[PDB]
Amino acid sequence: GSESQNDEKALLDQLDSLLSSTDEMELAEIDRALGIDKLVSQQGG
Amino acid sequence: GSTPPQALQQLLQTLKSPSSPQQQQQVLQILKSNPQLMAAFIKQRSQHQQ
């Protein structure tokens, strides 16, 4: 609605750290669903 | 009002929280339609890889 000021999104970045704590497989299930694996491959940037 | 990118943030909220099983499957459906958005998620693992 309003310009700038995320707040909510910022809250995610916090829990995001859990990713390192949790196995990549935990998200791998949904990850492959979006195609984040073949997203880069040979992109770089 | 008109931000297709932030759409990932909304759903991502359920993907990060211990939401129900149905929700988790929902978010994935959205991110799937947004290939440019999912890229944001990788940012985490990319900045938190070993």
How many domains does chain A fold into? 1
Q: How many CB atoms lie within 10 A of CB B36?
A: 10
Which residue from A minimizes the CA distance to B33? A34
- Amino acid in the structure at residue B33: S
Q: Are B14 and B29 in contact (CB under 8 A)?
A: no
Range of the domain at B39: 1-50
Size (chain B), residues: 50
Q: Specify the CATH number for the domain of residue B6.
A: 1.10.1630.10
Nearest neighbour of A20 by CB, restricted to B1, B38, B48: B48
Q: Which two tokens stand for residue B41?
A: 């998620």
How close does chain B come to A33, measured CA to CA in Å? 6
SS3 string of chain B? CCCCCCHHHHHHHHHHCCCCHHHHHHHHHHHHHCHHHHHHHHHHHHHCCC
Query: Which experiment gave this structure?
Result: NMR
Range of the domain at A14: 1-45
How many domains does chain B fold into? 1
Mutate one of A11, A13, A16, A43 to test the B interface: name it (highest B CB count within 10 A).
A16
